[PDB]
Every structure is written in structure tokens, then in C-alpha cells.
Ligand binder design. Structure first.
Ligand SMILES: NC(=O)C1=CN([C@@H]2O[C@H](COP(=O)(O)OP(=O)(O)OC[C@H]3O[C@@H](n4cnc5c(N)ncnc54)[C@H](O)[C@@H]3O)[C@@H](O)[C@H]2O)C=CC1
Ligand SMILES: Cc1cc2nc3c(=O)[nH]c(=O)nc-3n(C[C@H](O)[C@H](O)[C@H](O)COP(=O)(O)O)c2cc1C
Ligand code: SF4
Ligand code: FES
Lengths: 430, 63, 213
């Protein structure tokens, strides 16, 4: 199979994504949820891990780490401490709104994924860390958890399998840095949401010092479907090491901004022109696309023609898949102002613990503000490139890389526009 | 109001690589001397994972 | 926007504050959600509950949280100052937050911001003289495909136009709470031009189950 896309409705994991059916237990149970869960819980942890790692599922958070190895890191005998599965439902990355849909419309899929994942690695409980702004989504999740508890699906003797498992929901307080896994762990513990240093990895020391595995909502909600349908069915879609389906949020200067599930190796042009109704003013009006939210470098129109939205082909286009959040900017957009707003967002959302991000991101914010005004010189463009290279790779967490990358992409693909801006400011203001 | 002195050896500081060279230099010049042993810091046990202990008192209240 | 505290008659450590008994039971449930020996993990939800009861956080809820959780007050001060959802100043009854991040900026959110500004007669970061509205500008709120959008307290108002946000403000001034949803034709996140996916009925239980399970 060389061409990918045009996924049928029978192969979609996230049915009732748009909320057109019942989100409660009665409607979810008629859609295949909570079916034969006792069999998966009784087939052992290693069988679940083998089913996960045969499908080749990679982490949907944005790092793209393989899920089977990451989950099997906690398949070790316990030393008296409990083990915890922690679900990252923060979703603070701009352009990304898939986890809100998953929580709001399919909560029982998330609960079943929590139970199956906790059985796969011997977790004592589950801690769902939802965004603090998602009050209604958190209340819907609490209602569904109550319905699952009252039906005997979780709790003491969960699903009649002899396994004890609790699901908890913890609400955040409005911090984008708390989406980082170690910062999430620190925020659950009642501290400031500042990330830790690795090693120790969360499988060794995590929440409360216990072994902990932090997993995304999307990579958890698909696990019962993986164990039920099979790993080969999930691996039948996408390329090598890019298996399965993916939720895309198409937004920006597009006709129909929407969230839609699609095959992993779908072309970007086909995805945009099919699901979102095309960009405004036709395909020739496209100017730039950010494929993975604000943490990924942007690509111009000449690259989006022949690119595929998986991990490897987007890596080879010197960008990343990210969270599969496609932000589209047409020719009526100031690209410098958009990237400056992104850097301003990164300056506002930065924990300030470690030196290079804390100083340098504000430095880049000031430099890009002067770039938007045009009050600079090309020597400052090369200086900003060097500063971005100095920030990246020298920080505790990956927010510094996520703030360095968009500037590098903007410089690399739109240096003539910036130079024209500063030269017209110099010739107008003097 | 300046600081006046009558001691020519007030600013005399001599540097030696090892203790025995200093001892021999002092004994050669007829100076009664005293020797203080070198104090070195003993090695510590440093662990970043001790800040998040499950049941020990070495947890940090903040970071 | 100051991260130091100065004593005022309105905000002093002698300002009266205490939880209601039902809130004490809720605090007990929150504490019971956590392992023993790690009672300090409940600093965030109890502080949020105090803000929900009071509407803002003077320096009497912080000390009360430190007292009922046996944690130092400095840790509660750090928690309150780090996160942006906690209000250390008294905001109005309706706290309007307008997202101006780039996916919302591309869909003309500044038009919504200036619409709110000329409807309320204030600017960003200010409060109406009758203490009913507060207008601030925030980062992304996880509704980027429904841009432009605002958040009023717990509710999300999405796909807004200047006329729609003016209608929301006028209805809020009358005392009635609007429906927290997109004001366009779509319901939650579907494409406006019909359903391009998930148009079939779901297959149901036992569909595609592998053998041996
Ligand atoms: N989803 C979102 O909202 C956002 C996603 N991102 C993306 O997230 C990524 C950065 O996130 P991180 O988790 O910090 O980076 P990633 O490099 O570290 O690590 C992913 C996971 O693999 C584990 N891991 C990796 N190597 C390991 C080893 N040798 N031993 C044990 N565990 C190991 C880590 O513990 C972590 O849980 C970037 O790709 C960025 O684009 C960035 C911003 C927002
Ligand atoms: C600044 C920052 C913010 C992040 N925010 C989120 C987030 O909101 N949701 C998420 O799932 N992962 C987020 N991540 C990625 C996590 O560190 C981690 O990779 C993820 O929670 C679990 O990865 P997985 O998809 O393999 O399960 C963020 C990372 C960084 C550096
Ligand atoms: S890179 Fe920035 S957000 Fe990340 S640990 Fe350092 S200061 Fe905090
Ligand atoms: S960019 Fe405004 S809700 Fe995400």
C-alpha cells in the first residue's frame, strides 16, 4: 500500500466524536465500549503489552515515543510502593483541541483505557489531570466515572476480574507548563508546576515518589480498541513505524475548521481539501502551514504540496508531526506578527525555573517585537538565530525547544520578508 | 591617620608546593614554626531522586 | 499584576474567612482522594474551592488552607502566585476572558475584544464601575477550531461575532445565563458543510473482535 487516507467509518476508533449520540454509559455500551473487558483483564499484563507493541502505536502527546516500551518500563516487581497511571489531559498547546472532544463525548472510552492500561502495568489507581478551564468536561468525566463505579466496572473487583482499580480526576489551575509530564507530577503533589530533571525517569520516581507512567488521552482511549480488534488491524494503516489513525484539528484561515479522524499517512493537501473544505481563496492562496501546533516549525506552500502527515515524512521536512494540529495561514497574514504572538505566548507560559528559557525567551520576545515593527538590521536576524540555537538543548524541559523552533522555521523560510520589512522601516523612518 | 607599623615581616608571605618544603625552609632559617594540617572536604552522597522520596524526610517542600 | 503583597484594610490577615460545613465535607473528600503522608497534594483543589466560595483570594484563605492542611503558608503563597486561574484581587461577578493566541487571532478575535470594549466602556484589565464585568486577555483555551471564542466563568462561548458577543453581554446584564456553545450552525466541532465523517451508524458490540478473546 502506497497511498493512504480515505478512512472508512467502520475503522474509526473515536465514534461519537461530534457528540451526535449518547455520551453516557447506555449509549457507549451500544457502540462497543466496555465489551469483554474481563477477558482482557484476565489475559495478563504481558499479553496486553504485546498487543500494544505489535500494533506499533506511538505516543500521541507529540513526542512520538513508542508506547509498548514506555508502558513495559513499569512491568517490574513492586518494592512496597504503589504504581500509578497518570493521564495527561491538559492540552495547552494552541491549535490542539482533540482531547477536549475525547473527554466531552467519549468519557467511558477513556475510563476503559485507564483500566486496561493500569492492568497492563499493575497500577493501583489512575489520576486524570484535566485542564482547569475544562470545567464542564471534567464534570462530564466525573458523571461517567460515577456511572462506571455504580455499574461495577471499576473499583473493588473491577469488571468481575478480581483486580482493584480506582480512577481519580484532578483539575488544574491554568498553566501550560503543567502539561509536561514531570511538571504535571509536581502539580499533582501540590507544588508549583515546574518540571523535574531526568534521570530519575517517572517509571522509577514519579507521583509521590511512586512508580508512575504518564500517558496522553488519545493514546489511552485507543488501547481497549487495540486489545479488542487486534494489533495487526491497527498496524494495517499508515506506513512503517507510523501505524494507525490520528485525530487532526484543522484551524486558521480555512473554510471549515474542524476536528476529524484520519489515517496516519494522509497527504496534507488531500486532508485540507477533503475534510476542511479547502483554505480561503483556493489552494493558490496558501502561504504557510504549521503542522503540529505552536511547538513545530512552519512550512511554506511549496512543501505542503507533496508532504505526508506522519512522523517520518514531517521530520524529513525539517518540522514535526507534533499534536497533529494544522494551523493554516493564507497570503493575507502577517507571518512575523503570528510568530511574534506565538513567542509572546511562550513567554507568558514559561515556568522560569531554568536560566536559558527564563531569560532567552523574553529576549526573543523583545527581538521579534522589534522585528514586527521593523526596527532592526539583518545582523540582528543572525543574532536571533544564534540565540535560538543557544536556548535549544540547554534547558530542563522541552518548552525551550518549543520556543526556539518556530523562530528558526520563520527565519529559514521567510528571511527575505523580514529583510524587506526592516529596510522599508529604515527608508521610511529616516 | 594612616596605619603605621615597625614590623618588616608584616607582608612576608611565602608559597611552597608541599608541607615538607615549608618545614625545611623554616627550619633552615631558624624560625620557630607551627604547622596546621590541610583540611579537605569529605565526599558526599548526592542524589536528585532523594528530593521526591516516598517515605523519607528528605522531600523538598518546593523547588 | 504585582507578585508582592501589601497590607490594606480590604486585604489583611485579619480579614474574616472560613469555610462552610458543606465545604468542610468537600475538603474531607478531597483529602481522602490522596495517600496518607501526602496531604499537601490537596493544596490546589482546596484553594480552588476557597476561591469558588469567596470569588477571590485575600490573604485569609491562603492562611486557612495552610492551617487545615498543616503546610507552611509560603507554599500556599507560591501555589496561588504561580497559577493564573487564582484571583488575588476582587474581580467582578462575570469574568470575561478573551483568547488572543494566533489560531484565534487569525479568525479576528481583536474585533470581538474591541466589541466588548465599546459595549462595556472599559479596556483590558479593568473592571466596570458597577462591579459586574471584568475584561482580560488570555492564552489558548483549547477551542481553536471554534475560534474566535471567549470564556465567561465556567462557560465557553465559541464561534462568536461582534453581534453575538454583544448579545451575550446584553443577556448577561439582564441576569439570564446563555447557552455555553458555538453560536454558528454547527453544534460542537463538526464541519459547517455537513458531516464529512462519522456519517454511518456505529457498528456496535462484538464488531471486529479478534479470535481467542
Ligand atoms: N501535546 C502537547 O500539548 C504538546 C506536545 N509537545 C511535544 O512533546 C514533546 C516533548 O515532550 P517530552 O515528553 O518532554 O519529550 P520526550 O523526548 O522526552 O519523551 C517522551 C516520553 O518518553 C519517555 N522516555 C524517553 N526516553 C526514555 C528513556 N530512555 N527511558 C525512559 N523513559 C524515556 C519520557 O519519560 C517521556 O514520558 C515534543 O515532541 C513536543 O513537540 C510540546 C508541547 C505541547
Ligand atoms: C511544555 C510541554 C507541554 C506539554 N503539554 C502536553 C499536553 O498538554 N498534553 C499531552 O498529552 N502532552 C503534553 N506534553 C508532552 C508530555 O511531556 C508527554 O510526552 C505526554 O504527556 C505523554 O506522552 P505520550 O503521548 O507518549 O503518552 C507537553 C510537553 C511539554 C514540554
Ligand atoms: S525550559 Fe522554561 S518552562 Fe521548561 S523548565 Fe526551563 S524555565 Fe521551565
Ligand atoms: S488559540 Fe484560542 S482557544 Fe486555542
Amino acid at each position: 500500500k502506497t497511498s493512504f487516507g480515505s478512512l472508512k467509518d467502520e475503522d474509526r476508533i473515536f465514534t461519537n466524536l461530534y457528540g451526535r449520540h449518547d455520551w453516557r454509559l447506555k449509549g457507549a455500551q451500544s457502540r462497543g465500549d466496555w465489551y469483554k473487558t474481563k477477558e482482557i483483564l484476565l489475559k495478563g499484563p504481558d499479553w496486553i503489552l504485546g498487543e500494544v507493541k505489535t500494533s506499533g502505536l506511538r505516543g500521541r502527546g507529540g513526542a512520538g515515543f513508542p508506547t509498548g516500551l514506555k508502558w513495559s518500563f513499569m512491568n517490574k516487581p513492586s518494592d512496597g510502593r504503589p504504581k500509578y497511571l497518570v493521564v495527561n489531559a491538559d492540552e495547552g498547546e494552541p491549535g490542539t483541541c482533540k482531547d477536549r472532544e475525547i473527554i466531552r463525548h467519549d468519557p467511558h472510552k477513556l475510563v476503559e483505557g485507564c483500566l486496561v492500561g493500569g492492568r497492563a502495568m499493575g497500577a493501583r489507581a489512575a489520576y486524570i489531570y484535566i485542564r482547569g478551564e475544562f470545567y464542564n468536561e471534567a464534570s462530564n468525566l466525573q458523571v461517567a466515572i460515577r456511572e462506571a463505579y455504580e455499574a461495577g466496572l471499576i473499583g473493588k473487583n473491577a469488571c468481575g476480574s478480581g483486580y482493584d482499580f480506582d480512577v481519580f480526576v484532578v483539575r488544574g489551575a491554568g498553566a501550560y507548563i503543567c502539561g509536561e509530564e514531570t511538571a504535571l507530577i509536581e502539580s499533582i503533589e501540590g507544588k508549583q508546576g515546574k518540571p523535574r530533571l531526568k534521570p530519575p525517569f517517572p517509571a522509577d520516581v514519579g507521583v509521590f515518589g511512586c512508580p508512575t507512567t504518564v500517558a496522553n488521552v488519545e493514546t489511552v482511549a485507543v488501547s481497549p480498541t487495540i486489545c479488542r480488534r487486534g494489533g495487526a488491524w491497527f498496524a494495517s494503516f499508515g506506513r512503517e513505524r507510523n501505524s494507525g489513525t490520528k485525530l487532526f484539528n484543522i484551524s486558521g484561515h480555512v473554510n471549515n475548521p474542524c476536528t476529524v479522524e484520519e489515517e496516519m499517512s494522509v497527504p496534507l493537501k488531500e486532508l485540507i481539501e477533503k475534510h476542511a473544505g479547502g483554505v480561503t481563496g483556493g489552494w493558490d492562496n496558501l502561504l504557510a502551514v504549521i503542522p503540529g501546533g505552536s511547538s513545530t516549525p512552519l512550512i511554506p506552500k511549496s512543501v505542503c504540496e507533496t508532504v505526508l502527515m506522519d512522523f517520518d515524512a514531517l521530520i524529513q521536512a525539517q518540522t514535526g508531526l507534533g499534536t497533529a494540529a494544522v494551523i493554516v495561514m493564507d497570503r493575507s497574514t502577517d507571518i512575523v506578527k503570528a510568530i511574534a504572538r506565538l513567542i509572546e505566548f511562550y513567554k507568558h507560559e514559561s515556568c522560569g525555573q531554568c536560566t536559558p528559557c527564563r531569560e532567552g525567551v523574553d529576549w526573543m520576545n523583545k527581538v521579534m517585537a522589534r522585528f514586527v515593527r521593523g526596527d532592526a538590521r539583518p545582523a540582528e536576524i543572525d543574532s536571533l538565530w544564534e540565540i535560538s540555537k543557544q536556548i535549544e538543548g540547554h534547558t530542563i524541559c522541552a518548552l525551550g525547544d518549543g520556543a526556539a523552533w518556530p523562530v528558526q522555521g520563520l527565519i529559514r523560510h521567510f528571511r527575505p520578508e523580514l529583510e524587506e520589512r526592516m529596510q522599508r522601516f529604515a527608508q521610511q523612518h529616516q | 591617620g594612616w596605619a603605621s607599623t615597625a614590623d618588616p615581616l608584616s607582608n612576608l608571605v611565602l608559597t611552597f608546593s608541599t608541607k615538607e618544603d615549608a618545614i625545611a625552609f623554616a627550619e633552615k632559617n631558624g624560625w620557630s614554626y607551627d604547622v596546621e594540617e590541610r583540611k579537605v572536604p569529605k565526599p558526599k552522597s548526592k542524589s536528585y531522586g532523594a528530593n521526591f522520596s516516598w517515605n523519607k524526610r528528605t522531600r523538598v517542600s518546593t523547588k | 499584576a504585582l507578585f508582592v503583597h501589601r497590607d490594606t484594610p480590604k486585604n489583611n490577615p485579619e480579614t474574616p474567612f472560613d469555610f462552610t460545613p458543606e465545604n468542610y465535607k468537600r475538603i474531607e473528600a478531597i483529602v481522602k482522594n490522596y495517600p496518607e503522608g501526602h496531604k499537601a497534594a490537596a493544596v490546589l483543589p482546596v484553594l480552588d474551592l476557597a476561591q469558588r466560595q469567596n470569588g477571590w483570594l485575600p490573604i485569609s484563605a491562603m492562611n486557612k488552607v495552610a492551617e487545615i492542611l498543616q503546610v507552611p503558608p509560603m507554599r500556599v503563597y507560591e501555589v496561588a502566585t504561580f497559577y493564573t486561574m487564582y484571583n488575588r484581587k476582587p474581580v467582578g461577578k462575570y469574568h470575561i476572558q478573551v483568547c488572543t493566541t494566533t489560531p484565534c487571532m487569525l479568525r479576528n478575535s481583536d474585533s470581538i475584544l474591541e466589541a466588548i470594549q465599546k459595549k462595556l466602556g472599559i479596556k483590558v484589565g479593568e473592571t466596570t464601575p458597577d462591579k459586574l464585568f471584568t475584561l482580560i486577555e488570555v492564552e489558548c483555551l483549547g477551542a481553536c477550531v471554534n475560534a474566535p471564542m471567549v470564556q465567561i466563568n465556567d462557560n465557553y462561548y465559541e464561534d462568536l461575532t461582534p453581534k453575538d458577543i454583544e448579545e451575550i453581554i446584553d443577556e448577561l446584564k439582564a441576569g439570564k445565563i446563555p447557552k455555553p456553545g458555538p453560536r454558528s450552525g454547527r453544534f460542537s466541532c463538526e464541519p459547517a458543510g455537513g458531516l464529512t465523517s462519522l456519517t454511518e451508524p456505529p457498528k456496535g458490540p462484538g464488531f471486529g473482535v479478534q479470535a481467542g478473546l
